[PDB]
Amino acid sequence: TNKRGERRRRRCQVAFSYLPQNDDELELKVGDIIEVVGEVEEGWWEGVLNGKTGMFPSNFIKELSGESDELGISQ
Template sequence: MYDYTAQNDDELAFNKGQIINVLNKEDPDWWKGEVNGQVGLFPSNYVKLTTDMDPSQQ
């Protein structure tokens, strides 16, 4: 939904429209994810969840 610029070394920067692989949602405000080989925390309210497409539908 929004661009996010990391403020700390453990945070994940991304641009609007990038797909983030969510690794952990234990904290409702800060999720852990991976994008372009980088892993870090990001604010959950900056993203919108989508579901993976079933491979049989591709």
């Protein structure tokens, strides 16, 4: 639950296909950068991609979560 990070909108990079749209989610096609909610979904994020908003279980998307070598590095 690294909400202490960049807060609100935090940017993560997505891997290959976040396909997950049922109602109104984002699709991260091969390698998109998101700025979602960050760690607010602890291990999961919620955010927007190129204006397409959604949320993922960081499944296809790995990156972010409070930087300054605190991306899980020194906690």
